[PDB]
């Protein structure tokens, strides 16, 4: 109902991916030097991550070039009035799990920013919690003077004409770190080397534009059951981003926490604020749940996020945050009937999202960490509050899915569906899912990510094939809000 297909556009034959065998712990260090792509984590790296965005009549996407042994990052802008695509490719080609170009990394997504304000454009990219080190660190010193691998065009680069849209809007590194002239990687977003530390070991690039034209980024540090969320802001009067700051502490048990705990979920700027909204795993291997444990949310009063953060029900919230329990919503644990340690399995299936008109949405996933045992149990659980209500409703009555989406009045479940793009629809406020939309013919795709805006779904994809150097399209669907 109202939702159709705009556009399907072909950006390339032959964007990366991780056609070869799934390595692990033991043999991480035998990569095939075939053909094939070997991987260490998934395959998917081009059209994943934070790898697309609308700009004015453009889209800018951001991919790895295709073939094993290419890996460039590659920048490409499309324009929806013209139809043409042009396409930057730069120097610095994927570097792979812990440095080695053998093995696929799928983490090191390439995150895409451009600014309203100034029409640069900004891009992060494969980075996996990368540090300085030396020969006997787990990164064998591959990554000294380029654990951050920040890209940024000069002012306007945007709306250049199609032949100026070139390497050449980009800025080089000829700072006392820079690696050469083909370096175009910095090492901070401030523009101060001195900064470094600020931006070391840090993973996931994601970017939104305030209300007022700002843009924001945050990323993750650590993990596993010792995470943090850190921040930042683009000046675009000065063209450089502010430090990280963070929204939690890592170590929280040396800042008078219990124990640690890892984030798992998403900060994201809805509604005029920033937002966090995650699972924990806390450190804790004696509790019943295996890895993570609970929903959290909070958001933030301040324009930039720099304090008067408070939890669901307006409380004020400790800043940077210690205690999971400030802000803690509900235990999806609770619909799983096991106590016994590690008995309960929460990873997969968690997303949330606030409607413009505040309805607040989660979305999660609880099993039976023992999948043999008789009585197994696995629910969905989707947990809403609707605008003016009290009381959150939860409910099992659901089918589970990886994201939820927003626009206008509606939420939204998108992804593929024996290949094919489908779109599910209900109220904000409701449970009341309904599939609104499915493409039925064309070329199938492997996976995609979704960005939301315009009361649109920019749908960029990868197509299936063999290999690993495959085609990309992007698909604007209209949502009919
Ligand atoms: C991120 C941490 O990095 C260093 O600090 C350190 O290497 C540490 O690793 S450790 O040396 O083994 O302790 C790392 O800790 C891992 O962080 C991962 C992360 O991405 O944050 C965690 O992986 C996530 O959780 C996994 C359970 C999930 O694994 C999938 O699902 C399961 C399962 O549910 O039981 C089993 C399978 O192995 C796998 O499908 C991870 O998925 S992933 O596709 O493998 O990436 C991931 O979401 C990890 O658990 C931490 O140990
Ligand atoms: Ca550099
Ligand atoms: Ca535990």
């Known amino acids: 109902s109202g939702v159709l297909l705009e556009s399907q556009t072909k950006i390339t034959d032959g964007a990366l991916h991780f056609d070869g065998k799934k390595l692990n712990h033991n043999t991480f260090e035998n990569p095939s030097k075939s053909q094939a792509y070997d991987y260490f984590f998934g395959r998917n790296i081009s059209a994943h991550g934070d790898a697309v965005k609308p700009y004015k009549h453009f889209v800018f996407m951001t991919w790895y070039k295709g073939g094993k ?27 792979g799990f812990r440095g080695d170009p053998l093995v696929g990394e799928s983490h090191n997504t390439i995150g895409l920013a451009v600014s309203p304000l100034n029409g640069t454009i900004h891009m992060v990219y494969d980075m996996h919690a990368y540090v300085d080190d030396d020969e006997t660190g787990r990164f064998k010193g591959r990554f000294v003077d380029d654990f951050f691998r920040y890209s940024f065009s000069v002012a306007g ?25 083909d370096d175009y990687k910095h090492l901070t977003m401030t523009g101060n080397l001195q900064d470094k530390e600020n931006f070391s070991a840090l993973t996931y690039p994601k970017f939104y534009t305030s209300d007022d034209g700002e843009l924001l980024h945050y990323m993750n540090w650590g993990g596993n059951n010792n995470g943090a969320y850190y921040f930042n802001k683009y000046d675009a009067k000065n063209q450089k981003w502010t430090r990280f700051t963070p929204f939690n502490h890592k170590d929280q048990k040396t800042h008078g926490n219990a124990y640690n705990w890892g984030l798992y979920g998403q900060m994201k700027y809805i509604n005029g604020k920033l937002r966090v909204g995650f699972q924990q795993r806390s450190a804790n291997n004696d509790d019943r749940f295996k890895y993570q444990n609970g929903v959290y949310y909070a958001y933030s009063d301040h324009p930039d996020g720099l ?39 929460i990873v997969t299936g968690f997303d949330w999202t606030v409607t413009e008109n505040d309805d607040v949405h989660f979305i999660t996933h609880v099993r039976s960490t023992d999948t043999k045992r008789s009585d197994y149990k696995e629910v969905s659980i989707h947990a809403f509050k609707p605008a003016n209500a009290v009381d959150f409703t939860i409910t099992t009555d659901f089918t589970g899915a990886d994201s939820i989406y927003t626009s206008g009045d509606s939420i939204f479940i998108i992804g593929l569906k024996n290949g094919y793009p489908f779109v ?9 899912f309904e599939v609104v939309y499915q493409q039925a013919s064309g070329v199938k795709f492997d996976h995609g990510t979704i960005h939301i805006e315009n009361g649109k779904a920019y749908y960029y994809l990868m197509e299936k094939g063999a290999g690993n150097a495959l085609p990309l399209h992007l698909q604007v669907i209209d949502l009919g809000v």
């Open 307 to 345: 304090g008067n953060w408070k939890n669901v029900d307006g409380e004020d919230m400790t800043w940077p945050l210690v205690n999971s329990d400030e802000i803690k919503i509900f235990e999806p644990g609770d619909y799983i009937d096991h106590t016994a340690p590690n008995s309960v399995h």
């Open 424 to 432: 599910e629809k209900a109220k904000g406020g409701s449970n009341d």
């Open 69 to 95: 042994e290419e890996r460039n990052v590659m920048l490409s802008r499309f324009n929806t009035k013209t139809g043409v695509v042009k396409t930057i490719q730069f120097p610095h080609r994927h570097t």
């Open 157 to 181: 680069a945007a709306d250049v004409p199609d032949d100026e849209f070139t390497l050449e809007q980009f800025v080089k590194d000829t700072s006392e770190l820079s690696q050469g002239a």
